């Protein structure tokens, strides 16, 4: 044949699998790691945020970040050879670019990698399910690196591909989108957080209900890689929590499954939520309160008390965070309590 | 404060007075939590992915198992045999005892650091701080991407607890 | 008026129902607030 | 308290409609033995 030769080859074992997928996974995924890396080490991000984004500039690990395109570009893919940059790898490196790059090349790495999860999966006679679970991030990364930005003004307001530069991404939401108070995001932490426990527990819950089937102080070797033998008494399980927490994870297909759900699910609920933030559809609102916030100048809930923090986060950062607006806030206009 | 919106409060404030987000500990915290939440879906993923035979298509595949089974329901070999392969082969677990263990300790260890993070800044050993730490020749200051962090931080510092603060320094 | 074969029964056990209910009772508890604005 | 008007039919129906589904599907099955 002619195809199958390409197939036959690239498809069989050779340590680091490389498959029909790899063709797009490996290249995109590589560039991507590089894309972010080069920036942090050598590329500046000054011409977009007037902010230093490279070791070379003096930034540290927690400082370095691969900018994000000035609010002058908007959503233009900002092409290396596009009208804006015109294949001028220094200007193109200056107008940020690497972003759309890292992000788009990256966006594939995922598509690509998940595929690989399928390819290797359909080849090894298993349920792809892993590949499914992986939507969990695609949805996030899609919404949070493409959708949200695409919904707002410019690629600018999009994540930052930084360590701290990304923390900014938080606050900025809390401060403007007041995300913290958005149902959807909530399940987002309900799942991650909820799942982590689920993980840390099944992991340990298992370890302890381990049948001494080795000899001595090394229950790590006493396990049989070879054959079927429930290593953790499922019976010593239920009869444990059933009495300590009131409930029993009686079965392992569901246990070892419900663990798939928890996260992946929440993530989606996050990806939805943020989709909201894309079109500024946010949960800041809470009328019932604010309407009665008008009168009764003496009634106060945390909500408001909190909501106020936000209102400060705006007034102070906006001017320097959003430079392209040349904001100007005189000494007076800034909100402050009596004291500082 | 015991309540939903309360936590949010306890939080936003903190960032402001401790820059917690820039704290090496909380990191190792968000580290595991994120991990565990990823592993919790990983280990849960694989098992169900190499589940084994016992059902029709009408029947619920989940039914294939009885409490007090003597042999596990999954085909571990055909699992590692997959996952291992999916990038590296050796960055995988055949040692079920080890794996289930990795699940335990990761979340449980990071969370600790975190628990310590708060407990660390409890006596004011706040997160890092690089304000004005990057400058040019003349001294004209070049904002670090952390200076924004800090900018949004002041917005927080200023407002929190307006009226009481009867002095220049939030020494508490 | 000849019976179609595909008439398989339906399943939701004593427990799954507890979860199904715990699932709703919760969101209900969560969104209620936002459903009041 | 000035709140939304559908609070009840919204939140409420949200509970009783899906819940009633599960309820049905259970007693529909726990009655295979005619028990229930």
């Amino acid at each position: 044949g002619w195809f199958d030769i390409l197939d036959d080859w690239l498809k069989r074992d050779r340590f680091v699998f490389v498959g029909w997928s790899g063709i797009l996974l490996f290249p995109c995924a590589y560039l991507a790691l590089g894309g972010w890396l080069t920036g942090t080490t050598f590329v500046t991000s000054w011409y977009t945020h007037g902010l230093a984004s490279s070791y070379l500039e003096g930034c540290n690990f927690l400082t370095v970040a691969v900018s994000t395109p000035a609010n002058s570009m908007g959503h233009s893919l900002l092409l290396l050879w596009g009208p804006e940059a015109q294949g001028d790898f220094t200007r193109w490196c200056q107008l940020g670019g690497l972003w759309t790059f890292i992000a788009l090349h990256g966006a594939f790495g995922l598509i690509g990698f998940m595929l690989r999860q399928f390819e290797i999966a359909r080849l090894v006679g298993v349920r792809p399910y892993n590949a499914i679970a992986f939507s969990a991030p695609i949805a996030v990364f899609v919404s949070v690196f493409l959708i949200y930005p695409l919904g707002q003004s410019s690629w600018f307001f999009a994540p930052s591909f930084g360590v701290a530069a990304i923390f900014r991404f938080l606050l900025f939401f809390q401060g403007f989108h007041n995300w913290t108070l958005n149902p959807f995001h909530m399940m987002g932490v309900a799942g991650v957080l909820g799942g982590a426990l689920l993980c840390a527990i099944h992991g340990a819950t298992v370890e302890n209900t381990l049948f001494q089937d080795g000899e001595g102080a090394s229950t790590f070797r006493a396990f049989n890689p070879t054959q079927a033998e429930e290593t953790y008494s499922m019976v010593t399980a239920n009869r444990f929590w059933s009495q300590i927490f009131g409930i029993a994870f009686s079965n392992k297909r569901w246990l070892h499954f419900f663990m798939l759900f928890v996260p992946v699910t929440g993530l989606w609920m996050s990806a939805i939520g943020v989709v909201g933030l894309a079109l500024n559809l946010r949960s800041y609102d809470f009328i019932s309160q604010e309407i009665r916030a008008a009168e009764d100048p003496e009634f106060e809930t945390f909500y408001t008390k909190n909501l106020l923090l936000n209102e400060g986060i705006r007034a102070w950062m906006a001017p320097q965070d959003q430079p392209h607006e040349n904001f100007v806030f005189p000494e007076e206009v800034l909100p402050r309590g009596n004291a500082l | 404060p015991l309540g939903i919106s309360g936590t949010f409060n306890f939080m936003i404030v903190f960032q402001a007075e401790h820059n917690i987000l820039m704290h090496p500990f909380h990191q190792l915290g968000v580290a595991g939590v994120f991990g565990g939440a990823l592993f919790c879906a990983m280990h849960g993923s694989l098992v169900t992915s190499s589940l084994i035979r016992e059902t029709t298509e009408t029947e619920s595949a989940n039914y294939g198992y009885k409490f007090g089974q003597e042999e596990e329901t999954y085909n571990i070999v055909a699992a590692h045999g997959y996952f291992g392969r999916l990038i590296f082969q050796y960055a995988s677990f055949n040692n079920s005892r080890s794996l289930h263990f990795f699940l335990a300790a990761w979340r449980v260890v990071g969370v600790w650091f975190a628990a310590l993070g708060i407990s660390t800044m409890a006596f004011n050993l706040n997160g890092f701080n690089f304000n004005h730490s990057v400058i040019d020749a003349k001294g004209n200051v070049i904002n670090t991407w952390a200076d924004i962090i800090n900018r949004a931080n002041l917005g927080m510092e200023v407002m929190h607890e307006r009226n009481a603060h009867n002095f220049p320094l939030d020494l508490a | 008026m000849e019976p179609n074969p595909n008439r398989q029964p339906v399943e939701l056990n004593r427990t799954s129902l507890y979860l199904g209910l715990l699932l709703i009772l919760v969101l209900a508890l969560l969104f209620s607030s936002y459903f009041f604005n | 308290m000035e709140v939304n008007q559908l609070g009840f039919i919204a939140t409420a129906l949200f509970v009783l409609v899906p819940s009633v589904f599960l309820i049905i599907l259970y007693v529909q099955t726990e009655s295979q033995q005619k028990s229930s």
Partner: peptide, 30 residues
């Protein structure tokens, strides 16, 4: 009004704890 709606949920749920723990489908060792 709406605060009963909150308390009604809150409660019927504590009772979904009742049943799911005490009238829960038992683990059959076979």
């Amino acid at each position: 009004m709406e605060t009963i709606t909150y308390v009604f949920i809150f409660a019927c749920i504590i009772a979904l704890f009742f049943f799911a723990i005490f009238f829960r489908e038992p683990p059959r060792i076979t």
